[PDB]
């Protein structure tokens, strides 16, 4: 009933808060100025990047890309701990848990990256940097084209005005996708997803009662996400080939090989 679905929403929200250092709430406070914290160091060019080494952790495009690579691995780790909190996930066949993460994590990375983004740029290093969109486009190819589709997506997605409590359920729904290639036992995955989808719908009616068919708009975006992921795998396929002075992190190698 309604009560059970509310309890699921809250269990997931609490779990989201623990798993993810920088929430959409903190990120929006930073981006609009309303936090009382020191504003993020702005990285709008080659020099500002250089001066900003002190606030974050061979050639420039490549160094940015390898920074993006470090953060992804951490995201994958955070998303993995979050999954394990989704009721019934750890009782699935372990090979299915792996498959779900393999195909889901980048979809959640782009969903959650939108929390950190406006039309002008993206917070980095847990809100203490802000790397402009023009700077990321200005990078020499193929690195110029890497982040721009994530900005395009974020701009539309941010218009739905979801908060953390909505996003916690949406992300869980994405992870429990019964149509991922190679799943061994779909039915228990779908049973959990059906339950999350009802929890998401109730949440969207309660938390945005003036927004009608937010639930439906939000499901349509789950398909947009698969595109950006496929588009992204192919640019990475290109980068793997056309560049040599850079190795992909082993965890990201696991995820991307034999993927879409």
């Amino acid at each position: 009933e309604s009560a059970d679905l509310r309890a699921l929403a809250k269990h997931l929200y609490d779990s989201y808060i623990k798993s993810f250092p920088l929430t959409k709430a903190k990120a929006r406070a930073i981006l609009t100025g309303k936090t009382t914290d020191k504003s993020p160091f702005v990285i709008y060019d080659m020099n500002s990047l250089m001066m900003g080494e002190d606030k974050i952790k061979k050639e420039v495009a490549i160094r940015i890309f390898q920074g993006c690579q470090f953060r992804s691995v951490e995201a994958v780790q955070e998303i993995t701990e979050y999954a394990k909190s989704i009721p019934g996930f750890v009782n699935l066949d372990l090979n299915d848990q792996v498959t779900l993460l393999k195909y889901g994590v980048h979809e959640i990375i782009y969903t959650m990256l939108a929390s950190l983004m406006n039309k002008d740029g993206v917070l980095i290093s847990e809100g203490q940097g802000f790397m402009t969109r023009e700077f990321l486009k200005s990078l020499r190819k193929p690195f110029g084209d890497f982040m721009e589709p994530k900005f395009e997506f974020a701009v539309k997605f941010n218009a739905l005005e979801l908060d953390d409590s909505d996003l916690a359920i949406f992300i869980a729904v994405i992870i429990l996708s019964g149509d991922r290639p190679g799943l061994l036992n779909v039915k228990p995955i779908e049973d959990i997803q059906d339950n999350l989808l009802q929890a998401l719908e109730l949440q969207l009616k309660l938390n945005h009662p003036e927004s009608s068919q937010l639930f439906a708009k939000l499901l349509q975006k789950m398909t947009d996400l698969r595109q950006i992921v496929t588009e992204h795998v192919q640019l990475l396929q290109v980068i793997k080939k056309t560049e040599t002075d850079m190795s992909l992190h082993p965890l990201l190698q696991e995820i991307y090989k034999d993927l879409y």
Binding site: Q77, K84, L94, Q97, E254
Partner: peptide, 11 residues
Amino acid sequence: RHKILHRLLQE
């Protein structure tokens, strides 16, 4: 295969 993913899950 997926040794790290396995490790992160079994943790």
